[PDB]
């Protein structure tokens, strides 16, 4: 469900329909001035307000995925979500931190169908 | 209700927390909805005096509201403000009126509008005591349907008219600036047709979905309260 | 008779875990040394007679369009599916049209 919610952000942020809205702000960019200023302090926090639910989802996602991995061994497929989740996300310290605390306790076999990927 | 806050006082509490968070913007909406009680049942309650008169006109208001908000999904129609709908006070159906906006251009706006259609607490409590779970549900079902089994007629009416040369139907920054005040063509058109086929069959957030799960995700998107504290003050969401 | 069948049950079973097989060709398609778009070199390699992200995205949005029944845009079922990709394989004016190393009339 996390991972849903994430995604569903994600895919918003990458629509076309977000990059129409920033092109329509850009272009009432250029009394007008005050409300173009205060329509994008609005839209600045919007942003804000979206990247930190996405991180919130992002690292839910993470810890309840490497937690399931953790728990038992018939969901072991699901192992290639947690790297996708964390390969496209090196930048976020949270994701690196789960992963070294937690994730060092899964067992390594569990690695072993995706290892060409991690190496690279 | 004498007791309750006045209409004055929740427009003030609501223009006041614009500039503010998400959680005190949720949390101002919902003290404002605890004082603030529907009373929208009592139209068909002073008005019929007869029980069998008063049983008709709600049924065909509740069938007006299904198939205004199905057929307003299906074509994207926003602004759907207190002023913009009118009540007829003899057959009690609804009208729409100023449909400059549609086909979702309303999401393109600073503040976006976040509802399907407007299915607020006084809309709701015109329909009886079942709510949402009667007529309200089953209508909205049929008329789906119809629309589905419709799609390909559908999907060209509406190519005919989003290529007309004389219809400006796209937002611009002067409209935004205007419905919003407090006290290349080609790929868009393609892209809103895109939507429209997607809206015609199934395919919401990626997935399939049938009717009735359609018309679920419908429901619950427009009575959600956190997408109706995220609208702008002037929709009067808590009407 | 059991070719039917069997692509049947195979298109079902791939049908129904859809979300791992986008997560695992997620994961191979953004492999930095998987070299898998073609290139003029090896398309000229491979027919001798005697923005990356953009088109990654595309190939994820058509596996996920296969993996549903979005054929040509509109939903169809297993056995729908099936009949069209059969329909598709064994039409002559499709076999005339590719290169003669594919060998169509063997
Ligand atoms: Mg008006």
């Not at chain 1, 993470?62 to 192992?79: A, K, P, T």
């Not at chain 2, 129609?77 to 003899?90: A, Y």
């Not at chain 2, 006290?183 to 009735?212: C, D, H, I, W, Y």
């Amino acid at each position: 469900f996390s991972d849903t919610q994430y995604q569903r952000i994600e895919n918003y942020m990458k629509s076309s329909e977000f990059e129409n809205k920033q092109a329509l702000l850009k272009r009432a960019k250029e009394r007008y001035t005050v409300k173009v200023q205060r329509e994008l302090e609005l839209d600045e926090l919007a942003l804000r307000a979206l990247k930190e639910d996405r991180k919130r989802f992002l690292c839910k996602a993470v810890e309840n995925y490497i937690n399931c991995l953790l728990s038992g061994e018939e969901h072991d497929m699901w192992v290639f979500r947690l790297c996708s989740l964390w390969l496209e996300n090196s930048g976020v310290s949270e994701v690196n931190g789960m992963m070294k605390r937690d994730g060092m306790k899964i067992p390594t076999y569990k690695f072993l169908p995706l290892m060409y990927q991690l190496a690279a | 209700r004498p007791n309750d806050f006045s209409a004055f006082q929740c427009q003030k509490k609501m223009m006041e927390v614009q500039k503010k968070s998400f959680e005190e913007k949720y949390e101002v909406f919902m003290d404002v909805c605890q004082n603030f009680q529907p009373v929208f049942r009592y139209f068909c309650m002073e008005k019929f005096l007869d029980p069998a008169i008063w049983f008709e006109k709600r049924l065909a208001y509740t069938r007006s509201v299904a198939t205004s908000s199905i057929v307003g999904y299906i074509l994207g129609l926003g602004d759907r403000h207190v002023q913009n709908i009118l009540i007829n006070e003899q057959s009690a159906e609804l009208v729409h009126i100023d449909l400059g906006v549609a086909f979702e251009q309303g999401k393109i706006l600073p503040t976006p509008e976040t509802v399907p259609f407007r299915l607020t607490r006084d809309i709701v409590d015109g329909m009886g005591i079942t709510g949402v779970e009667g007529v309200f549900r089953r209508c909205c079902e049929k008329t789906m349907e119809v629309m589905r089994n419709s799609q390909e007629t559908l999907l060209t009416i509406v190519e005919v008219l989003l290529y007309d040369p004389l219809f400006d139907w796209t937002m611009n920054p002067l409209k935004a600036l205007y419905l919003q005040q407090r006290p290349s063509f080609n790929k868009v058109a393609e892209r809103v047709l895109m939507r429209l086929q997607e809206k015609l069959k199934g395919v919401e957030e990626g997935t399939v979905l049938s009717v009735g799960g359609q018309v679920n995700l419908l429901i619950q998107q427009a009575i959600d309260p956190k997408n109706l504290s995220r609208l702008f003050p002037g929709w009067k969401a808590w009407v």
